[PDB]
Design a protein around this ligand. Structure first.
Ligand SMILES: [Mg+2]
Length: 581
């Protein structure tokens, strides 16, 4: 028998740390934009072992872990540094609901960092998956038995010793320490929900929903396994009302009417229901639930400047940088309320945008951005150094999958390919590649072209400067809008709410909260009064929360304290947005 699962004291206590279930953490449906009613959650307590990187499956699993918290986190019950010479092993038993008999059974991973191999009852489930940020799945039907089944998963993660997308993760001792700069605790292993679902053999795997409100319609591509011969019916509705329906070919874009469309904006993030059913004659072969927000983003010339226009009109995008780090969970928010909380705080503070920094969150995060009403800029996580040939192939493969997995999100409006020259290559080529693959979103070839040895490809939709404290004097070109992809960086160490007391650093330390409030509001007023009229179209304030020893959050890292006057910030943001329109 393994050592019984042991909770670990967390470095900091968030509002949610003490409410994480033991056996059923993160119970919510993991994929809200592609739903079926039947599923089973495999989160909870698994058997666990750490071997050397090249070891096969151990004979004994000596410990237990709580999935889906990485081994470095306190919430896992392990809380240990994982190096490139290690490999994580997970094992649990599970049963399949008997009412799924006669369907395929899919085993779904939201994310696992970095290289994941899966066995069901001792048989390999499919190809090894490499990539820490993209969801993946295996059809495990033929490997199952009718009673208890065993699932074994190995996960290797080299973090920065590898050539893969890593973001802020570095191999570090897990206890709070002085220093560390802008780089943080590593995340190794399964860090999003693991689950099962039944499907027909012929089933939908992907739904691409692309709003075309100027033509009062929704463009849709239905995609999947074994359904390429088929038509599909797609229906748009709200409550009990059918707004529109059309039948068209699987695998080829067609349109569904959406008359008199109620547009999605941050102010009114209206979501229509969507249902898609591949057909054989008149017979439904599968059926998935979804949703859309009817919105567009593009560039246009407005009042003499290139601007980003939402639903054909310019609105200034005032956002924060959000690194998605947790003191208790590292890469995994403790509860769904915790995950949503950071976005709710954006709304409370009057921001209409968020830049998710060199990390891709689970689908539920996109759901909450879609539902709460925030524009999202999505960074592709960076490599730590110049990639060689195989590393380029791998990074591009991961990026393609991340793009393909987020086509339908109304919140997501902009891809940030690269950041401050980190692992940079092929700047212009990649901007063209991403834009051609997802042309209804904006693309930023390189964030921070003014700094850090970063090389500007010259193309994409935005010229993006990082200016601290800022806001600087960026101006648009004839072809590209101007954005401030990072500014601010105002620090304040909150006594009782420091990851490491006295460790905190920032771009400009504030003596007290009154100073912080006055300084922050001054930056927004500067953007409103001077920069936005001269062609600045968006700004990204560093940052929503302190992270480790970077104490430049609007909130503390434990989310227990809001450092700013909410009403004053909200008023300033609202004035900026209103002026811009
Ligand atoms: Mg990792």
């Amino acid at each position: 028998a393994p050592r019984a699962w042991t909770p670990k004291p967390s470095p900091m206590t968030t509002p949610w740390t003490d409410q994480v279930p033991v056996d059923n953490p993160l119970p919510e449906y993991p994929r809200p934009q592609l739903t079926r009613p039947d599923w089973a959650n495999l989160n909870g307590i698994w058997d666990f072992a750490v071997t050397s990187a090249n070891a096969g499956q151990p004979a004994t699993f000596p410990e237990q872990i709580r999935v889906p918290f990485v081994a470095e986190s306190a919430l896992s019950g392990i809380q240990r540094k994982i190096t490139q010479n290690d490999k994580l092993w997970y094992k649990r038993t599970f049963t399949v609901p008997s009412n799924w008999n006669g369907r395929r059974v899919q085993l779904n991973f939201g994310a696992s960092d970095w290289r994941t191999t899966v066995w069901v009852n001792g048989r390999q489930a499919g190809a090894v998956h490499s990539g820490g940020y993209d969801a993946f799945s295996y059809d495990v039907t033929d490997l199952l038995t009718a009673g208890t089944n065993t699932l074994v998963v190995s996960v290797w993660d080299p973090t920065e010793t590898g050539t893969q997308a890593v973001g802020k993760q570095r191999i570090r001792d897990v206890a709070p320490h002085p220093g560390g700069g802008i780089l943080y605790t590593a995340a190794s292993g399964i860090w999003q929900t693991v689950w099962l679902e039944p499907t027909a053999a012929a089933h939908v795997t992907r739904l691409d929903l692309v709003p075309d409100p100027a033509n009062s319609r929704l463009k849709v591509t239905v995609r999947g396994a074994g359904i390429s011969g088929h038509q599909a019916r797609v229906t748009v509705s709200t409550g009990g009302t059918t707004v529109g329906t059309a039948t068209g070919p699987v695998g080829t874009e067609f349109t569904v009417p959406v008359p008199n469309p109620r547009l999605w904006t941050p102010e009114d993030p209206f979501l229509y229901d969507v249902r898609a059913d591949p057909l054989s004659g008149g017979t439904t072969v599968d059926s998935v639930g979804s949703y859309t927000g009817m919105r567009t983003i593009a560039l246009a010339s407005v009042g003499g400047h290139q601007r980003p226009v939402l639903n054909g009109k310019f609105v200034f995008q005032t956002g924060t940088l959000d690194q998605g780090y947790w003191p208790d969970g590292i890469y995994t928010a403790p509860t769904d309320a915790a995950l949503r909380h950071d976005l709710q705080k954006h709304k409370d503070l009057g921001f209409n945008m968020v830049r998710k920094h060199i990390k891709v969150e689970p689908q539920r995060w996109f759901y909450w951005a879609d539902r709460l009403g925030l524009l999202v800029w999505q960074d592709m996580p960076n490599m730590e150094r110049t990639p060689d040939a195989a590393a380029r192939t791998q990074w591009e493969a991961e990026y393609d999958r991340i793009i393909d997995q987020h086509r339908s999100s109304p919140s997501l409006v902009l891809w940030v390919n690269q950041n401050e020259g980190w692992g940079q290559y092929d700047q212009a080529r990649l901007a063209d590649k991403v834009k051609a693959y997802d042309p209804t979103r904006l693309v930023d070839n390189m964030s921070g072209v003014n700094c850090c040895g970063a090389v500007d490809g010259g193309n994409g939709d935005v010229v993006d400067h990082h200016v601290y404290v800022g806001p600087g004097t960026t101006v648009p070109s004839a072809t590209r809008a101007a954005v401030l992809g990072e500014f601010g960086g105002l620090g304040f160490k909150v006594a009782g709410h420091e990851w490491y007391p006295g460790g905190g650093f920032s771009y400009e330390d504030q003596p007290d909260l009154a100073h912080l409030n006055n300084r922050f509001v001054g930056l927004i007023d500067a953007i409103r009064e001077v920069r936005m009229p001269r062609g600045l179209s968006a700004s990204v304030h560093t940052e929503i929360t302190d992270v480790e020893n970077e104490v430049n959050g609007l909130l503390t890292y434990d989310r227990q304290v809001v450092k700013v006057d909410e009403a004053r910030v909200r008023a300033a943001n609202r004035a900026l947005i209103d002026a811009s329109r």
